[PDB]
Ligand binder design. Sequence first.
Ligand code: CL
Ligand code: CL
Ligand code: CL
Ligand code: CL
Ligand code: NA
Ligand code: NA
Ligand code: NA
Ligand code: NA
Ligand code: NA
Ligand code: NA
Ligand code: NA
Ligand code: NA
Ligand code: NA
Ligand code: NA
Ligand code: NA
Ligand code: NA
Ligand code: NA
Ligand code: NA
Ligand code: NA
Ligand code: NA
Ligand code: NA
Ligand code: NA
Ligand code: NA
Ligand code: NA
Ligand code: NA
Ligand code: NA
Ligand code: NA
Ligand code: NA
Ligand code: NA
Ligand code: NA
Ligand code: NA
Ligand code: NA
Ligand code: NA
Ligand code: NA
Lengths: 275, 275
Amino acid sequence: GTDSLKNSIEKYLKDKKAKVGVAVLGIEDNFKLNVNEKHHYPMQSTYKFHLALAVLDKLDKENISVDKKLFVKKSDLQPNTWSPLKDKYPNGNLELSFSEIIKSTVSHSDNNGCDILFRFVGGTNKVHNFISKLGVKNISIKATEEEMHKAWNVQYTNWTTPDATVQLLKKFYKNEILSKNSYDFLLNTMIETTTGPKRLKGLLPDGTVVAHKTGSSDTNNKGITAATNDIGIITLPNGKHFAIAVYVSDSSEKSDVNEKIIAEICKSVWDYLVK
Amino acid sequence: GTDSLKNSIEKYLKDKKAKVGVAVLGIEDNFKLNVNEKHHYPMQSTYKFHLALAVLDKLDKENISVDKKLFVKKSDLQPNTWSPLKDKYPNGNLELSFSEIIKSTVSHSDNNGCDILFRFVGGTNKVHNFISKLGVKNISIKATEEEMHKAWNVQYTNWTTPDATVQLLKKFYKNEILSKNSYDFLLNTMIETTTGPKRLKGLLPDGTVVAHKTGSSDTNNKGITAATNDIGIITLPNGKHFAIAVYVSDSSEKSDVNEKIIAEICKSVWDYLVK
Ligand SMILES: [Cl-]
Ligand SMILES: [Cl-]
Ligand SMILES: [Cl-]
Ligand SMILES: [Cl-]
Ligand code: NA
Ligand code: NA
Ligand code: NA
Ligand code: NA
Ligand code: NA
Ligand code: NA
Ligand code: NA
Ligand code: NA
Ligand code: NA
Ligand code: NA
Ligand code: NA
Ligand code: NA
Ligand code: NA
Ligand code: NA
Ligand code: NA
Ligand code: NA
Ligand code: NA
Ligand code: NA
Ligand code: NA
Ligand code: NA
Ligand code: NA
Ligand code: NA
Ligand code: NA
Ligand code: NA
Ligand code: NA
Ligand code: NA
Ligand code: NA
Ligand code: NA
Ligand code: NA
Ligand code: NA
């Protein structure tokens, strides 16, 4: 049962030198599991999901096609930051569709796409408020990728509880937030994600559908990796779904271990729910 | 003349809120210009040139083909760092040639490729020593990309004077360091660079050959961008060449201005040498 699954996860965590938050919520059925859920975990890129929700809601409500294009200045494409968009368009100064920018920001975790979209939607506060008004408490959106890059502690201002995340994922998956077509688009984009293949997906059967968004910090001079995260919705063999969010925070472990913590926890949940 | 060109550059710098180092050295002819050259400027990615020299020298001396392959672990491909290699191979755990890795590291400034190559060649000290033994003083190579990312000041341990850079570029261009074939390869790789198209290249005639390597820091909480750099060898219309290195350091200016400082300085030099 759920209590025994929870105990297994807690036992697994006993020798990991990290603070690990876990939440799970069934979509169709009533399953719920939380571990270490009352802490505030740094989100890193996982908040590009929240951002995409706010952007697609604005495009919906204002009747703006996702095929309309922003002018992306070269200055919008900062160097020495993770950015597949910048490598694809190294001169910048070009027109890119909201669709193209959202796909890169979500599926490929583009840091420059993220900030382009924050500027479009009206800033971090707009997104913070948007999420809060969906009725999901315990999420804080305060800093852009550029801002996070300026100073180590700024990432902690973009925080969440793990149960907030899965509450939000469930509202999403049930298409309670967006238009049908914007929902379909963001869901496809989340399944198309290419980052974190050894996180939630890592130990699940080949071809399992995992609609997800990763997040990753750097490491400080004390050996601490603030955030190694993955959040998403997984399709079970009988077509039902569960939302899961894992935050491996403030870790002294190497990256292979941090990813494996996510993969193993997810595999434990999968095995329980398929049984 | 050179003195008047120097005075023009110094006048140009008077209203820029940055500390800007410049050096120029003719390759075939005896031209020399230095501005603010006695400071120690953070290199950032420009030291991937030095790294490539050390790597290609090792491959030469040990008789290892550039087509031989390293196993690149997924852990070698860190997240949330600039890395076209990681976006191309998001699962990692694959065999990649030295050639492929060097091209990505130099032409596309890959941060993970850089560290893969530092590990191959035997670490930062090996590269530091290699450069020092070419007879070029005033270069310090101390920290990998991973190390720089851990703490703001670590980038300053990877420092250079601008005149050291052009001395090294000239030894290179005259094929005094490597085998003919490794020289040809690295030169092609430097012309193929796609980063910094609005730096040294920015205001030169379309199609000008510029074999170069950029470097870029992030910005801190005080608004300072430690490094915005570009170094290379430029072909004049009569087929002769000059080496140039520009380091825009500790800048309070926005990125468009920092890039423009490089472009304008280079254009001033170009205009003088073509006349
Ligand atoms: Cl592409
Ligand atoms: Cl929705
Ligand atoms: Cl490619
Ligand atoms: Cl050479
Ligand atoms: Na369910
Ligand atoms: Na439920
Ligand atoms: Na609990
Ligand atoms: Na909670
Ligand atoms: Na376009
Ligand atoms: Na994309
Ligand atoms: Na950015
Ligand atoms: Na909230
Ligand atoms: Na931060
Ligand atoms: Na909560
Ligand atoms: Na995926
Ligand atoms: Na994936
Ligand atoms: Na995953
Ligand atoms: Na720890
Ligand atoms: Na760590
Ligand atoms: Na010359
Ligand atoms: Na000279
Ligand atoms: Na001088
Ligand atoms: Na000097
Ligand atoms: Na290969
Ligand atoms: Na490449
Ligand atoms: Na790296
Ligand atoms: Na030296
Ligand atoms: Na640094
Ligand atoms: Na020197
Ligand atoms: Na180039
Ligand atoms: Na270029
Ligand atoms: Na350039
Ligand atoms: Na300054
Ligand atoms: Na600045």
